Structures are given as C-alpha cells and as structure tokens.
C-alpha cells in the first residue's frame, strides 16, 4: 500500500534522528539472534555464538550500516523501490538464494529496533507508515522471485 504524504513526512522526520552508526547493526544482530538459521549466510563473520558476541561483532555492526544505507536509499526513492533494489535483489535471490520470508523478518526486526530507540515517539500511526516501507523494501528485494 502507498504511503500518504503525511506518512512520508513522518517516516522521513523520524529517520533523520536515527543513529546511523548503530541501528543497522542492532537490526542485523537481532535477526541473527532471534532467527538463528540466518547465521548460515554469515559464516565468514566470525563469532556469533552468543547474543553479546553477535551484537558486539564488528562485522555485524559494519554490515548493518550497509543494510541501513539501503533502507535510506528506499526512503529517498519510495516511488521506485523496484529500480532502487534491483541489484540487491539479484544478489540475495539469484546468488545467495535467501528465502524471501527472511526479508520480511528483517524488516520487522528493524521496526522493533526503531520502537526500541524512539519509544513513545514511535506511535501507532508512525509504525503503520514504516510497515508500508519495510513491506515495500522486502517486496522489492524479492522482485527476482516474482
């Protein structure tokens, strides 16, 4: 579903306050902790044996930053998520064969992290707008399966 203009302003305003060094790493780390099979795609990343080990892993933090940047690209091109994520879709679908349900999971983990950081500022209407974003992103990332 399309974001409304009010929703687009709300998501963008909140996103400007996000800690870009950290939030991506927390989302990726939580994915690896909450859904541990996703660790299979990151065997070269080192120690992922405990929650602390995952969250404090420099490669998880670094790679999370990249994940966050891609979400930032989506927020700047919401009318063209297909185009924006075309390359990433090929990598994740054609090369890595990540099951698409996992893209949905990461999206929702990111939403949980935003709630964690922003508290009562992450209002139900604000969440609803972000659910549209993460759904659009997941869908764009799974495009090669469509």
């Amino acid at each position: 579903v399309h974001l409304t203009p009010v929703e687009k302003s709300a998501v963008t305003a909140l996103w400007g306050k996000v800690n870009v060094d950290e939030v991506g790493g927390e989302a990726l780390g939580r994915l690896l902790v909450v859904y541990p099979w996703t660790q299979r795609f990151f065997e070269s990343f080192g120690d992922l044996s405990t929650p602390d080990a995952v969250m404090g892993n420099p490669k998880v933090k670094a790679h999370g930053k990249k994940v966050l940047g891609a979400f930032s690209d989506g927020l700047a091109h919401l009318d063209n998520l297909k185009g924006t994520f075309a390359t990433l879709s090929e990598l994740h679908c054609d090369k890595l064969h990540v099951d698409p349900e996992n893209f949905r999971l990461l999206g929702n983990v990111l939403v949980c992290v935003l709630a964690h950081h922003f508290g009562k500022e992450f209002t139900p209407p604000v969440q609803a707008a972000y659910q549209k974003v993460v759904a659009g992103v997941a869908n764009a990332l799974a495009h090669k399966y469509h």
């Binding site: 909450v34 939403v111 508290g119 992450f122 969440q127 659910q131």
Partner: protein, 141 residues
Amino acid sequence: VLSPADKTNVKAAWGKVGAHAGEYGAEALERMFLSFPTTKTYFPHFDLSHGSAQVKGHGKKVADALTNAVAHVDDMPNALSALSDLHAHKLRVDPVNFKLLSHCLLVTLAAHLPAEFTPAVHASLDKFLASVSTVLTSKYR
C-alpha cells in the same frame, strides 16, 4: 520449544508489565489494526475507534490471557483450550494474523520497556508468542 532460559526471560519480562498489561494489550491491538487493516475484519462487532473502551477492555483480556499462558507455560494446550476453541474452531483465525499481533506486542514492549528488551529477551518473547499462537490456531480437542 522454549528453553529453561526462555521461560525465565518471559516470566521476568512479562512480570515487569504489571498494572500496564491492559494498556500494552490495547496498544498492540491498535498498532495491529492501524498497521495491518485486514485484521479489523475479525472484529465487526467491536467499536474499533481510537481510544475505544471496548478495545481497551479487550486489550486487558488479551494481556490477561497471556499472563495465564505464562503461568501455565508447560501445559499451554490444556490451560488455553477455551481460547483455542474460540480462535481455531469458532473464529477460524488465519495464523498470519497471530504473527502480526505478536510482532505488534514486541513493538509495544520494546517502546515501553527498552531496558528489558535485550536481544535475548526479544528472542524468548518471540518464541513464547509463536508458541501461544500455535496453541490458539490448532484444533486439538
């Protein structure tokens, strides 16, 4: 399947909810209805308006049911048979909707109890809610 550590996390985290149970249950429902509008089709007999007394009251029922589920965490099928009757036999709720409410519950807990919502507790709560969801959507009588 919850580990012993999972059960300690859920007991601890949900125990910190306390008198805010209905508040959080209501908020999770509101979050679900706004974020995933198709879920509203299960509640045509409810006043779903924002700040509805019926939603606040139902949030309390949902939250109180979870407390019952945590209290009988090793015998959830028996403990929650009436609710399985309701959700699986009567209402025939598509399991996707349970994933949606569970997610909204985690969002609510993360926003309100950020110190408690560690990666490990997040994991355990997600498993607990999935477990409750499986029981409520299964026909086992």
